[PDB]
Amino acid sequence: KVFGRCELAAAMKRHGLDNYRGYSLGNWVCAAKFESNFNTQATNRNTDGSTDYGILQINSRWWCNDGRTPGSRNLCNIPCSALLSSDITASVNCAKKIVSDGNGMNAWVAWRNRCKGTDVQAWIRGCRL
Ligand SMILES: [Cl-]
Ligand SMILES: [Cl-]
Ligand SMILES: [Cl-]
Ligand SMILES: [Cl-]
Ligand SMILES: [Cl-]
Ligand SMILES: [Cl-]
Ligand code: NA
Fold first, then answer.
1. Residue 67 neighbours by CB under 8 Å, 6+ apart
2. Could you tell me the sign of the dihedral formed by the alpha carbons of 57, 42, 29, 79, in that order?
3. DSSP secondary structure, 23-39, as one string
4. Cα–ligand 4 centroid distance for 89 (angstroms)
5. CA distance 85 to 105
6. Catalytic positions
7. Counting ligands in written order, which one lies closest to the CA of residue 46?
8. What transmembrane ranges does the database entry give?
9. Domain 1-129 architecture
10. Any alpha helices (H) in the chain, and if so which ranges?
11. Domain boundaries in the chain?
């Protein structure tokens, strides 16, 4: 599913991501834009042989099981395919665990390089939230 910007903002807000660990909704929308272009089906292979899955590009090295990332963990206790669903519940639940890990949203490289310290409020402009 390719979400619209405000559709995704509303879904993230409903599932409790707005101000989760102190990160306003625009941070999460910005991260999704640059990680996945709002496409739940996005997958990208990493150099180390892990893969990133879904709207927030969650890595099989630590967070989900894809059966092909040797020596990896499954800390969200989910198949990585669950992170590709049209329903973002699994991705949001796992992202809450990731952002609680101690480095906040720096876990998302595209957030750190493209969203951090920018006007992230712009990402929820016009949305009826
Ligand atoms: Cl914001
Ligand atoms: Cl497996
Ligand atoms: Cl594996
Ligand atoms: Cl959803
Ligand atoms: Cl933080
Ligand atoms: Cl500034
Ligand atoms: Na894994």
1. none
2. negative
3. B-HHHHHHHHHHHHTTB
4. 6
5. 22
6. 35, 52
7. 7
8. none
9. Orthogonal Bundle (1.10)
10. 5-14, 25-36, 89-99, 109-114
11. 1-129
